[PDB]
Amino acid sequence: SYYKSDPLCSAVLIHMKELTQHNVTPEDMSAFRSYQKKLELSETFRKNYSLEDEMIYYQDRLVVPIKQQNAVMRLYHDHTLFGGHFGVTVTLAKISPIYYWPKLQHSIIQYIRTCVQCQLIKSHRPRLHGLLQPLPIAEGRWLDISMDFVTGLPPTSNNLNMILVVVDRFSKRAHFIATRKATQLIDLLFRYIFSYHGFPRTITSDRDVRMTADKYQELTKRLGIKSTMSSANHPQTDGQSERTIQTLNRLLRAYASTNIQNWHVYLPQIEFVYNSTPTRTLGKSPFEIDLGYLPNTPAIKSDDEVNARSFTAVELAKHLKALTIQTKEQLEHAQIEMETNNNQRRKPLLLNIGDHVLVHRDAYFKKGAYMKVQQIYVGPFRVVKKINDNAYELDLNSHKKKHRVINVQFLKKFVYRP
DNA sequence: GAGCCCGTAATACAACAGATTTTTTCTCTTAGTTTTAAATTTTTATATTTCGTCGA
DNA sequence: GAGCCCGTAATACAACAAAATCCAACAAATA
DNA sequence: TCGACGAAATATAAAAATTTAAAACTAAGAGAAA
DNA sequence: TATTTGTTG
DNA sequence: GGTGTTGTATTACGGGCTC
DNA sequence: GGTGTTGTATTACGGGCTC
């Protein structure tokens, strides 16, 4: 039960094979590509096709007619003759030692994008699927605020359990919100610690139940506060707070190495140390990014001046304007530097309407659902809206899934074939 | 240089790195409880609505 | 080219990516 | 085809006196999701 | 001799 | 509307000397 | 004695044409 026991006088290679035969030319519809290929063969000298008793082949490899292309690549890709659904390299190593197939690599990668199980099972670095495209930089001071918290720490005396952080996107000002892992009184403690400065414009946070929080969201809609609400298991958007708790974790380890179970005393020292230390992407201390009144003043900084903003009373407007201008251009510099050092391999994905994208078992099933060697056979979903440049909402075929926003790091767009 | 086709063929990039239950609120869904007010009678004069009928 | 000192100063590279239970099973420690 | 009347339906304020929902109010039970 | 308790894929 | 982001050793580029 | 390692899209380099 072997193949190639069939003559085909109507295919692309007929023009190539009549270079010796010159007998019959029964071309088909859309066979004008064969005419152009024969013209290119005529103006060049690459004649290596061998014609031996109906076996027309290349120098050592069997050229296959285009009628049975899919049959051959399915035979050497599926388990009919022990393929195994591998990549283009193993498929070439199975086919190219035996067959030639002009533009074989493009045909094989097209088949990889065609075969459904390879789309659902393979990953092929599904963490580089969209550009960086960071947050818009800022406005006037204390208008954008980043919100997140680490769920659990070694508990203190039974009054405090975990640390919440507030750092603004502009100035990156540390904060010490020590919660109890909380209730609807989140707005009480949160209000007491941001309203020390004032009400922001948008909150960059995750889809956490203390902030998804239909009771708390309506408060923000009434008050005039937006909510970015980073999607399920995509904590990258929170950013400044995540980077702060990275710096806080080192600081908390430093100040509580031998002093576990009472770190709530040292937490204001943690935030004050974070506040007094200059950063890199802005080059100035977060006091200086705000009203520059580093109160410790161990020594005067470089370019010695008055450096006493307490003496200035009415002229603070020009000083804050100057700080705002230089910090805004520094934020733009940080944005472009991040975009340069990150997008060296980040391939974009821009669809925005009418596709059948997937979600490869991350933010689709539960974060608490165990990942194992169980098959990854998420069905072909649909996309109806372009919610952002780096995400697309889906019509999750479930009860509700409680969210339908999927960042591009889980999509891996499905492609059909007739 | 300058590009193009195509055919091979190198090429850095990332996955294998014990896996699962909890922890703390929240938010639909769906079955059980509780307090309370309401379906047909007398009735009494008042008035207006809407049928219902009758008359020349 | 050719290298060196020194003084700044850019520069990719990785950490924040929820936290903490055991599962199964080796061998030490008493009583 | 305009006039002429009869008559149930309500409120009404009590005392009452058996059945019927019936919608707030709890309380599992799943499903999220840092 | 059963119930522990260090560490490790 | 809504989607990364800085801390850190490490390393690259100008004044001043030998040319 | 004892300590990474390949699968995979992706991309870079020679024959043959225009020069």
PDB file of all heavy atoms in Angstrom, chain E:
ATOM      1  P    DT E   1      10.914  -5.500  68.043  1.00  0.00           P
ATOM      2  OP1  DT E   1      10.429  -6.877  67.805  1.00  0.00           O
ATOM      3  OP2  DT E   1      11.927  -4.904  67.142  1.00  0.00           O
ATOM      4  O5'  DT E   1       9.658  -4.511  68.098  1.00  0.00           O
ATOM      5  C5'  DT E   1       8.470  -4.829  67.381  1.00  0.00           C
ATOM      6  C4'  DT E   1       7.510  -3.654  67.378  1.00  0.00           C
ATOM      7  O4'  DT E   1       8.026  -2.609  68.241  1.00  0.00           O
ATOM      8  C3'  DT E   1       7.308  -2.991  66.023  1.00  0.00           C
ATOM      9  O3'  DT E   1       6.029  -2.372  65.978  1.00  0.00           O
ATOM     10  C2'  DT E   1       8.425  -1.956  66.012  1.00  0.00           C
ATOM     11  C1'  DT E   1       8.418  -1.491  67.464  1.00  0.00           C
ATOM     12  N1   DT E   1       9.749  -1.031  67.943  1.00  0.00           N
ATOM     13  C2   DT E   1       9.814  -0.089  68.943  1.00  0.00           C
ATOM     14  O2   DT E   1       8.828   0.398  69.466  1.00  0.00           O
ATOM     15  N3   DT E   1      11.084   0.266  69.312  1.00  0.00           N
ATOM     16  C4   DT E   1      12.270  -0.218  68.792  1.00  0.00           C
ATOM     17  O4   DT E   1      13.365   0.164  69.190  1.00  0.00           O
ATOM     18  C5   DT E   1      12.129  -1.203  67.746  1.00  0.00           C
ATOM     19  C7   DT E   1      13.345  -1.802  67.104  1.00  0.00           C
ATOM     20  C6   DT E   1      10.891  -1.558  67.378  1.00  0.00           C
ATOM     21  P    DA E   2       5.313  -2.058  64.574  1.00  0.00           P
ATOM     22  OP1  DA E   2       4.232  -3.053  64.400  1.00  0.00           O
ATOM     23  OP2  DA E   2       6.345  -1.915  63.524  1.00  0.00           O
ATOM     24  O5'  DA E   2       4.651  -0.623  64.805  1.00  0.00           O
ATOM     25  C5'  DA E   2       3.649  -0.458  65.801  1.00  0.00           C
ATOM     26  C4'  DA E   2       3.671   0.950  66.371  1.00  0.00           C
ATOM     27  O4'  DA E   2       4.982   1.241  66.924  1.00  0.00           O
ATOM     28  C3'  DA E   2       3.376   2.063  65.363  1.00  0.00           C
ATOM     29  O3'  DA E   2       2.477   2.998  65.936  1.00  0.00           O
ATOM     30  C2'  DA E   2       4.749   2.686  65.113  1.00  0.00           C
ATOM     31  C1'  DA E   2       5.415   2.501  66.464  1.00  0.00           C
ATOM     32  N9   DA E   2       6.876   2.494  66.409  1.00  0.00           N
ATOM     33  C8   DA E   2       7.668   1.704  65.622  1.00  0.00           C
ATOM     34  N7   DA E   2       8.955   1.909  65.789  1.00  0.00           N
ATOM     35  C5   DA E   2       9.012   2.898  66.758  1.00  0.00           C
ATOM     36  C6   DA E   2      10.092   3.559  67.381  1.00  0.00           C
ATOM     37  N6   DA E   2      11.374   3.301  67.096  1.00  0.00           N
ATOM     38  N1   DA E   2       9.803   4.496  68.308  1.00  0.00           N
ATOM     39  C2   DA E   2       8.517   4.751  68.589  1.00  0.00           C
ATOM     40  N3   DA E   2       7.420   4.197  68.072  1.00  0.00           N
ATOM     41  C4   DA E   2       7.740   3.269  67.154  1.00  0.00           C
ATOM     42  P    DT E   3       1.695   4.050  65.008  1.00  0.00           P
ATOM     43  OP1  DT E   3       0.289   4.090  65.470  1.00  0.00           O
ATOM     44  OP2  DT E   3       1.998   3.739  63.594  1.00  0.00           O
ATOM     45  O5'  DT E   3       2.385   5.444  65.368  1.00  0.00           O
ATOM     46  C5'  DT E   3       2.411   5.887  66.718  1.00  0.00           C
ATOM     47  C4'  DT E   3       3.474   6.950  66.919  1.00  0.00           C
ATOM     48  O4'  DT E   3       4.794   6.365  66.770  1.00  0.00           O
ATOM     49  C3'  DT E   3       3.412   8.123  65.929  1.00  0.00           C
ATOM     50  O3'  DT E   3       3.323   9.356  66.637  1.00  0.00           O
ATOM     51  C2'  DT E   3       4.729   8.016  65.153  1.00  0.00           C
ATOM     52  C1'  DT E   3       5.621   7.318  66.164  1.00  0.00           C
ATOM     53  N1   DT E   3       6.802   6.641  65.550  1.00  0.00           N
ATOM     54  C2   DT E   3       8.065   7.001  65.957  1.00  0.00           C
ATOM     55  O2   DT E   3       8.275   7.840  66.815  1.00  0.00           O
ATOM     56  N3   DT E   3       9.082   6.340  65.326  1.00  0.00           N
ATOM     57  C4   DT E   3       8.968   5.376  64.343  1.00  0.00           C
ATOM     58  O4   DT E   3       9.947   4.838  63.837  1.00  0.00           O
ATOM     59  C5   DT E   3       7.617   5.046  63.957  1.00  0.00           C
ATOM     60  C7   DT E   3       7.371   4.016  62.895  1.00  0.00           C
ATOM     61  C6   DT E   3       6.610   5.691  64.568  1.00  0.00           C
ATOM     62  P    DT E   4       2.625  10.636  65.956  1.00  0.00           P
ATOM     63  OP1  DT E   4       1.576  11.123  66.878  1.00  0.00           O
ATOM     64  OP2  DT E   4       2.271  10.269  64.567  1.00  0.00           O
ATOM     65  O5'  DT E   4       3.795  11.725  65.886  1.00  0.00           O
ATOM     66  C5'  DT E   4       4.770  11.658  64.853  1.00  0.00           C
ATOM     67  C4'  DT E   4       6.147  12.002  65.387  1.00  0.00           C
ATOM     68  O4'  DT E   4       6.921  10.788  65.535  1.00  0.00           O
ATOM     69  C3'  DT E   4       6.987  12.868  64.472  1.00  0.00           C
ATOM     70  O3'  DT E   4       6.603  14.286  64.602  1.00  0.00           O
ATOM     71  C2'  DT E   4       8.405  12.548  64.941  1.00  0.00           C
ATOM     72  C1'  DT E   4       8.300  11.080  65.367  1.00  0.00           C
ATOM     73  N1   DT E   4       8.875  10.139  64.365  1.00  0.00           N
ATOM     74  C2   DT E   4      10.242  10.030  64.251  1.00  0.00           C
ATOM     75  O2   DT E   4      11.026  10.658  64.940  1.00  0.00           O
ATOM     76  N3   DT E   4      10.667   9.147  63.298  1.00  0.00           N
ATOM     77  C4   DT E   4       9.881   8.379  62.461  1.00  0.00           C
ATOM     78  O4   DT E   4      10.359   7.611  61.634  1.00  0.00           O
ATOM     79  C5   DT E   4       8.458   8.543  62.629  1.00  0.00           C
ATOM     80  C7   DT E   4       7.504   7.765  61.771  1.00  0.00           C
ATOM     81  C6   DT E   4       8.028   9.403  63.564  1.00  0.00           C
ATOM     82  P    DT E   5       7.420  15.375  65.477  1.00  0.00           P
ATOM     83  OP1  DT E   5       7.701  14.899  66.851  1.00  0.00           O
ATOM     84  OP2  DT E   5       6.629  16.616  65.356  1.00  0.00           O
ATOM     85  O5'  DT E   5       8.759  15.650  64.641  1.00  0.00           O
ATOM     86  C5'  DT E   5      10.012  15.759  65.310  1.00  0.00           C
ATOM     87  C4'  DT E   5      11.161  15.547  64.339  1.00  0.00           C
ATOM     88  O4'  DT E   5      11.090  14.205  63.772  1.00  0.00           O
ATOM     89  C3'  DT E   5      11.183  16.510  63.138  1.00  0.00           C
ATOM     90  O3'  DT E   5      12.489  17.066  62.971  1.00  0.00           O
ATOM     91  C2'  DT E   5      10.815  15.607  61.965  1.00  0.00           C
ATOM     92  C1'  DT E   5      11.435  14.302  62.417  1.00  0.00           C
ATOM     93  N1   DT E   5      10.949  13.106  61.653  1.00  0.00           N
ATOM     94  C2   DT E   5      11.870  12.318  61.003  1.00  0.00           C
ATOM     95  O2   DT E   5      13.069  12.525  61.043  1.00  0.00           O
ATOM     96  N3   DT E   5      11.344  11.270  60.306  1.00  0.00           N
ATOM     97  C4   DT E   5      10.014  10.930  60.188  1.00  0.00           C
ATOM     98  O4   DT E   5       9.645   9.957  59.535  1.00  0.00           O
ATOM     99  C5   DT E   5       9.090  11.799  60.884  1.00  0.00           C
ATOM    100  C7   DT E   5       7.614  11.537  60.825  1.00  0.00           C
ATOM    101  C6   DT E   5       9.599  12.840  61.571  1.00  0.00           C
ATOM    102  P    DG E   6      12.671  18.601  62.524  1.00  0.00           P
ATOM    103  OP1  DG E   6      13.518  19.259  63.543  1.00  0.00           O
ATOM    104  OP2  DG E   6      11.327  19.143  62.227  1.00  0.00           O
ATOM    105  O5'  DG E   6      13.488  18.515  61.145  1.00  0.00           O
ATOM    106  C5'  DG E   6      14.676  19.298  60.956  1.00  0.00           C
ATOM    107  C4'  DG E   6      15.763  18.476  60.279  1.00  0.00           C
ATOM    108  O4'  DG E   6      15.566  17.084  60.619  1.00  0.00           O
ATOM    109  C3'  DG E   6      15.761  18.519  58.757  1.00  0.00           C
ATOM    110  O3'  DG E   6      16.608  19.576  58.283  1.00  0.00           O
ATOM    111  C2'  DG E   6      16.338  17.160  58.381  1.00  0.00           C
ATOM    112  C1'  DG E   6      15.879  16.261  59.513  1.00  0.00           C
ATOM    113  N9   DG E   6      14.706  15.459  59.185  1.00  0.00           N
ATOM    114  C8   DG E   6      13.447  15.596  59.704  1.00  0.00           C
ATOM    115  N7   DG E   6      12.594  14.735  59.230  1.00  0.00           N
ATOM    116  C5   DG E   6      13.340  13.964  58.351  1.00  0.00           C
ATOM    117  C6   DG E   6      12.952  12.868  57.548  1.00  0.00           C
ATOM    118  O6   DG E   6      11.839  12.344  57.458  1.00  0.00           O
ATOM    119  N1   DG E   6      14.016  12.377  56.795  1.00  0.00           N
ATOM    120  C2   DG E   6      15.291  12.882  56.820  1.00  0.00           C
ATOM    121  N2   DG E   6      16.190  12.283  56.028  1.00  0.00           N
ATOM    122  N3   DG E   6      15.664  13.912  57.569  1.00  0.00           N
ATOM    123  C4   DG E   6      14.642  14.398  58.308  1.00  0.00           C
ATOM    124  P    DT E   7      16.159  20.476  57.026  1.00  0.00           P
ATOM    125  OP1  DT E   7      16.299  21.890  57.438  1.00  0.00           O
ATOM    126  OP2  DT E   7      14.847  19.977  56.563  1.00  0.00           O
ATOM    127  O5'  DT E   7      17.246  20.175  55.876  1.00  0.00           O
ATOM    128  C5'  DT E   7      18.156  19.075  55.981  1.00  0.00           C
ATOM    129  C4'  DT E   7      17.937  18.064  54.861  1.00  0.00           C
ATOM    130  O4'  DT E   7      16.917  17.119  55.247  1.00  0.00           O
ATOM    131  C3'  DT E   7      17.492  18.659  53.525  1.00  0.00           C
ATOM    132  O3'  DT E   7      18.508  18.476  52.548  1.00  0.00           O
ATOM    133  C2'  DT E   7      16.212  17.892  53.156  1.00  0.00           C
ATOM    134  C1'  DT E   7      16.201  16.708  54.113  1.00  0.00           C
ATOM    135  N1   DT E   7      14.823  16.313  54.561  1.00  0.00           N
ATOM    136  C2   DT E   7      14.199  15.220  53.995  1.00  0.00           C
ATOM    137  O2   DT E   7      14.705  14.538  53.123  1.00  0.00           O
ATOM    138  N3   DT E   7      12.945  14.960  54.493  1.00  0.00           N
ATOM    139  C4   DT E   7      12.274  15.662  55.477  1.00  0.00           C
ATOM    140  O4   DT E   7      11.152  15.351  55.859  1.00  0.00           O
ATOM    141  C5   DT E   7      12.986  16.786  56.026  1.00  0.00           C
ATOM    142  C7   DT E   7      12.356  17.624  57.099  1.00  0.00           C
ATOM    143  C6   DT E   7      14.210  17.051  55.551  1.00  0.00           C
ATOM    144  P    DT E   8      18.458  19.301  51.171  1.00  0.00           P
ATOM    145  OP1  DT E   8      19.847  19.429  50.678  1.00  0.00           O
ATOM    146  OP2  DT E   8      17.645  20.515  51.408  1.00  0.00           O
ATOM    147  O5'  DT E   8      17.642  18.352  50.176  1.00  0.00           O
ATOM    148  C5'  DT E   8      18.159  17.074  49.832  1.00  0.00           C
ATOM    149  C4'  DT E   8      17.246  16.358  48.847  1.00  0.00           C
ATOM    150  O4'  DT E   8      16.076  15.844  49.539  1.00  0.00           O
ATOM    151  C3'  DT E   8      16.714  17.216  47.691  1.00  0.00           C
ATOM    152  O3'  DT E   8      16.787  16.466  46.478  1.00  0.00           O
ATOM    153  C2'  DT E   8      15.263  17.475  48.107  1.00  0.00           C
ATOM    154  C1'  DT E   8      14.930  16.165  48.788  1.00  0.00           C
ATOM    155  N1   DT E   8      13.751  16.231  49.703  1.00  0.00           N
ATOM    156  C2   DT E   8      12.726  15.331  49.534  1.00  0.00           C
ATOM    157  O2   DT E   8      12.726  14.475  48.668  1.00  0.00           O
ATOM    158  N3   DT E   8      11.694  15.467  50.421  1.00  0.00           N
ATOM    159  C4   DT E   8      11.584  16.393  51.438  1.00  0.00           C
ATOM    160  O4   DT E   8      10.616  16.439  52.186  1.00  0.00           O
ATOM    161  C5   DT E   8      12.687  17.307  51.563  1.00  0.00           C
ATOM    162  C7   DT E   8      12.666  18.357  52.632  1.00  0.00           C
ATOM    163  C6   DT E   8      13.710  17.187  50.699  1.00  0.00           C
ATOM    164  P    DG E   9      16.687  17.179  45.036  1.00  0.00           P
ATOM    165  OP1  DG E   9      18.066  17.470  44.590  1.00  0.00           O
ATOM    166  OP2  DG E   9      15.686  18.264  45.058  1.00  0.00           O
ATOM    167  O5'  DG E   9      16.076  16.034  44.109  1.00  0.00           O
ATOM    168  C5'  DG E   9      15.463  16.366  42.875  1.00  0.00           C
ATOM    169  C4'  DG E   9      14.680  15.180  42.342  1.00  0.00           C
ATOM    170  O4'  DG E   9      13.912  14.596  43.412  1.00  0.00           O
ATOM    171  C3'  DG E   9      13.659  15.508  41.273  1.00  0.00           C
ATOM    172  O3'  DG E   9      13.349  14.338  40.536  1.00  0.00           O
ATOM    173  C2'  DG E   9      12.472  15.958  42.110  1.00  0.00           C
ATOM    174  C1'  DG E   9      12.569  15.026  43.317  1.00  0.00           C
ATOM    175  N9   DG E   9      12.209  15.666  44.570  1.00  0.00           N
ATOM    176  C8   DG E   9      12.930  16.609  45.261  1.00  0.00           C
ATOM    177  N7   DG E   9      12.348  17.001  46.359  1.00  0.00           N
ATOM    178  C5   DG E   9      11.171  16.267  46.395  1.00  0.00           C
ATOM    179  C6   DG E   9      10.133  16.262  47.348  1.00  0.00           C
ATOM    180  O6   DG E   9      10.046  16.929  48.385  1.00  0.00           O
ATOM    181  N1   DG E   9       9.123  15.368  47.001  1.00  0.00           N
ATOM    182  C2   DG E   9       9.119  14.580  45.875  1.00  0.00           C
ATOM    183  N2   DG E   9       8.060  13.777  45.701  1.00  0.00           N
ATOM    184  N3   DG E   9      10.087  14.578  44.977  1.00  0.00           N
ATOM    185  C4   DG E   9      11.075  15.442  45.301  1.00  0.00           C
TER     186       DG E   9
END
